[PDB]
Each structure stands twice: as structure tokens, then as C-alpha cells.
Amino acid sequence: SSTVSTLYGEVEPSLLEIAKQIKLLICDVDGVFSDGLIYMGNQGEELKTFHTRDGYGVKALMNAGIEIAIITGRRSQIVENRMKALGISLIYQGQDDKVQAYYDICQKLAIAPEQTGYIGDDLIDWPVMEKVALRVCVADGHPLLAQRANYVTHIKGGHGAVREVCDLILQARNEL
Amino acid sequence: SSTVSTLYGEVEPSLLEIAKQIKLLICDVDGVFSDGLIYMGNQGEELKTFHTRDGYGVKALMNAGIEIAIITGRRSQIVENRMKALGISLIYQGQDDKVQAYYDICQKLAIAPEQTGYIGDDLIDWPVMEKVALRVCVADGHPLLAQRANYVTHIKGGHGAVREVCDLILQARNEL
Amino acid sequence: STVSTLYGEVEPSLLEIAKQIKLLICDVDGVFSDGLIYMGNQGEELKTFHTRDGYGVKALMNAGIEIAIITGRRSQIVENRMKALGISLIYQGQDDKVQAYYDICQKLAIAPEQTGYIGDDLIDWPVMEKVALRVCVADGHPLLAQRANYVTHIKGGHGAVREVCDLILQARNELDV
Amino acid sequence: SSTVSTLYGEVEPSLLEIAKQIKLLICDVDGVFSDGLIYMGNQGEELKTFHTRDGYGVKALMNAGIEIAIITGRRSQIVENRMKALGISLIYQGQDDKVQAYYDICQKLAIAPEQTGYIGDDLIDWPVMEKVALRVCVADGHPLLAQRANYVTHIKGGHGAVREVCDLILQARNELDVH
Ligand SMILES: [Mg+2]
Ligand SMILES: [Mg+2]
Ligand SMILES: [Mg+2]
Ligand SMILES: [Mg+2]
Prior knowledge:
The structure is a homotetramer. Chain A has 7 helices and 10 strands. Chain A has 176 residues and is α/β, with parallel strands linked by helices. Chain A has a single domain, classed as Rossmann fold (3-Layer(aba) Sandwich), CATH 3.40.50.1000. Chain A is globular, with a radius of gyration of 15 Å. Chains B and C meet through strand 4 of B and strand 5, helix 2 and helix 3 of C. The complex binds magnesium ion (MG) (4 copies).
């Protein structure tokens, strides 16, 4: 074939061409930054997990001048805390309609969809992904989303899937 | 046309026909909505996990007019909170004998066992499953239960097993 | 050559050992729990237990088989959970694991030949070597795994205890009573 | 073939020679002692996991006279609590650049890089690892670090990767028989 090695497997050269040119990466939270689990307690405690290797990836992308934004349907202090800690400021929570949040991001940043990527794990993510150039489903994402993606990560959501996509972009940019 | 492709594998047309008819889906909690773990704390705290992709599936079935009920042997505020959040009201906790809860559900809804499904992970679930049309064991459920089931999920309990069953019914209904 | 179980294949002589077990002794961390200690910034600590193990232990006791715990650590979380399961013979903070075993053997009048033990690390070996059914969980320490006469297929904290309950219950034709 | 069996696989005798003479083992925390996850709550609670069998290994090394040091980029009371429970004193947290902490450890203990090991899981660990003799990446560490390591653990970070390295050292010291 015509495939090129990554740190994680093989991709079409056409995908690296797309990845090279990304200036905006938008991520869902649950199932992408986390593994999709919501930890619930009898006193109404709620936890969520994030992976340490993802932080390093996001920071590397932003150091390269790539904007990062988050769009999620849930709303938590957890997400505010984590995203602020990673230095991500474009945070959209409580979104039933992810398309409108995406439009708001577009109007703020003025970045074209050909230069935008999105990492999702479920069907609610599809209306935005469909519009952009890099369409990522995490390894364990909904199989119907995985069918529609142009990159399916090797690493599971919440375990380094975000880092994998950061590494893909950096490799494409010849910075890794 | 021996089998019909789903998002997860291949099913017999007879099984999709059973799925198409389902008006009531009954689920166990631990090992089905969760991975079977109970997290216990040094001040008596308790956590349990639920998965975001399951939440989406359960809402989709309810939007389609299908009733959802829960039967669990344990009792927690966690389960009350999670089920109310999803809009599930038929919640049976602290049930050692699941058959009595099943009969109560049947009488409350006037829905026949031929239009009912049950998702279980252990032997206590079998007395209810044996009565109903769609008898699901989660992928990692007890292996004797898996042998008796007429559908074994591919996704593990607590990670989208419930969503997989939701998808099967929605596919069967031509709504996926 | 081997006999099938719900989980894989064993020697008939192992099933024959399992059939006559009257006492099953378990360590806790890495056996009932997933081997992790969840620690928080305000001194929170969590430990996990698995619902299919709970069911197995109750089924084993319903069948007339005694359950005891011997752990090197002391945990009130563990006291709470074992008491909830109906287990009464709980020995914690046990440096001399073998002395605890001796006391259990005496208190119940059950011989080592009718006893099994489920462990995950080397500190478990001094009690294990004394008993007939010597179990290491699937993801136990490899030195203990190579000494065990049954290595579970299911990982620690995820049904390994249930798997051993099932081995005994299958040997007795009592898997689903 | 020149390899020697361990409890986990095969290694070159050269690696056992290095492991035999380690006097200092430096570890990252997240992804090495833990599974790399940070549990965060709505009241700002934080949890981290540690594996029950790693303590026996760390203690066995300390009882052999081997010094243990910890260098992490994150900061938590969790890590203070866990490491103090092991009798470890050289705990460096909130380290953006791990090389400085390493130099400080060298100053304090006067142990040379040739007698030093490091267990990491990501690229930030490499500038210290590159300087020392035993260079461990955990099984599921970042693939670029795994390429650079001289030992890649079989067991995943947070599930006994630390214990595995302890066992390698004990085996090398002839304190742990492997048939
Ligand atoms: Mg999601
Ligand atoms: Mg269950
Ligand atoms: Mg243990
Ligand atoms: Mg790390």
C-alpha cells in the first residue's frame, strides 16, 4: 500500500496532509478526555478521570500555536478545574446542540473547517465532526461514529487517545 | 441472509424480530450499568460508576416509547440519583428475589413477557430472564448465565453493554 | 486428560480436591479488591469489591463451606464488607499469617486437607503451602503463580474469588442452587 | 541467544549486571506508581491509585540499602502521604524540569549515575533517564520513551511495574531465585 508509520500504527499519507494543516482541535470530554465513566456517591459526590499523558500533548499543541476548545453536554466544576489547569480557555458546557457552540468558536477564532479537527466518542459529536477536516473517533467510541471517522485512535478514550492525536499532528508537522 | 449485520456482529433475523417488539427493558444495576465494582471508603463512602454512552442509549429507547425498569439487590442513593437523572421511575432496590419485582412491573405496565427484555450479569437474574423474550447477558457476565442467554453483548458491563442492547432494539425498529 | 470448568480446563485431581473443601481462606488486597488503594488529598481511602464475588461467597456458605479472611493489613472498610457478606472469621493486621491459620483450623476443627487459600503475593505462601487448594489470582505475583495448584483465569477484584467458589460448587454439582 | 530468564521474560546479561549494582532508584509517580489517571471531584477532591504489591518491592530494595527518590511534575498531599508511609524522604513534587531535582539528589546522596536507575512513563522523564544506567519505561508508557529505554516493563504502570523493577534488582543481587 501507501501507508506511513506513526508511533501507534499505520495511516494513509492523505491523513497526515490533513493533520499537518490543523490550527484548531475541538474535543468532547466524556469518553475522550475521560473513559466515559461517571463516578457517583451516596452523598452526591461525582468524580471523573483524566490521563496525565494527555496534558503533555495538549500543551505541546498549544505551544505550536494550535487552539484547543472543548464542547460538552454535561456541566461540572470538574471540567472547569481540569481545563483551566491545562490552560484551555474555550470551554463550552451544558451543550445539547454542539453545532451552535462550534459556530461560536468559529466566529471567535475565524479558523476555517479545513483547518479544524474534532475528537469525539458518540453520535452527538457527529454533526460537528462532519463539518471539519480531521474527524477522530477514539478506539472504544461508538461503532457508528468509528465508521464515519477518518482517524480511529489506537488508544482508548481517557487513556491517552487525546495524546495520540496530538502526536499525530506534531508528527505531520515534522516536530516529532 | 442467514444473519443480519449489527454494529457489533451478526444476529439471526428471529432475534431482531424479538427486539423489534420490545416494549419494556428491565436491567440489573451492578455488573450491567456498572462493571460490578463497589468502591468503599474509610468514612463509609460508596461510589459506583455509570457510562455516558449507556445514558445516551437509555434516553433514545425512552424517546421511542419503550419503558425502562431497574431491579437490584443492593440499595443506594446513588441508584436513586442516577435513575431519576435519566428519567427512569420504575426502580426496585433491595430485592433478593427479583421475580416478585418483575411481577409488580408486569402488573404496573400491563406489558407481556413476550414484549420484555432483561439485561443481567449473574445467576440471580436468570429467574426473570427465563420468563421473557429477550434474555441478555453482558459480555463479561457469569459464564453460566452467558450460556443460557439468547443475546450476549460484545461490550463489557459498565462500558456500553446497555447501549449495545439499546442499539439492537433501535436497529430492529428501523430507527438506527 | 483435563476436565472443563466454566472458565477453562483443570486436572481431575484438582476437581477432586475442590469437591471436599470445607474451609476457604482468602487474603483481601489483590484477591477481593482490584489490588489498588485509592488515596485522596484529605486522607480519603477507597477499596473495591466485586458483586459477582459477593454472590459466590454467599453461595459457598449456603452449601455449608466455611469462609475466613487472613490479611496482613488492617482495614475497617474490609471489616464492614466481610461482616455484610456474613463472614465472621476475620483476622487482620496479621504478621504471623500461619498462627492465624492454626487458630482457624483449631476453632473449626477442619484439617488442612479440606482447606483452600486464595492469595496474590509471596506473604501468602506460608499459609498456602499448608493447604490442599492453593490458588493464585490470574494477575497475582508471578512467583506465587508458579507455586499455586490453581491459577484463576479472572483477575483479582473482578471475579477471581467467584471463580474459585464456582470450582468448588461445580465439583459438588451445586453451581446454581 | 544470550538471554537470561526473569519472572517476567528474558533480558540480556548486560542488564542484570547494571541492575545488580544499583544503589539509587528514582521514580516518576503518575503512570509509574499510579495508572496515570487523576480522579477529580466537584468539590475539588482528588484521588490517585497505588498498587498493593509495589510496597513490598520498594521496602525490599530499601532493606538492601538502596536509596529511593521520587520526582513528579504534579503536587499532592496524596504523594506525600504515600511516600512517607514507605519511609522515603527524597520527594520532589511540582517539578517542571526534573533535571534540577536529579542534580539535588546527586548532591545529597553522592551516588553516581552508573549506580542509578530511573522508572518513567513520558518524555519529561527522558532528560534524567538519559543520564543514568538503568533506564526503565513502563509497559504502557509513551511509545517514544519505550524506544529509548534499556528495560521496558511487562507489567503496566500502576499495576506492578515498580515491583517488577524491584524484582529484577533482587534477582540480580542473587536475593531472588528465578528458575
Ligand atoms: Mg462523549
Ligand atoms: Mg448484577
Ligand atoms: Mg493481597
Ligand atoms: Mg508520569
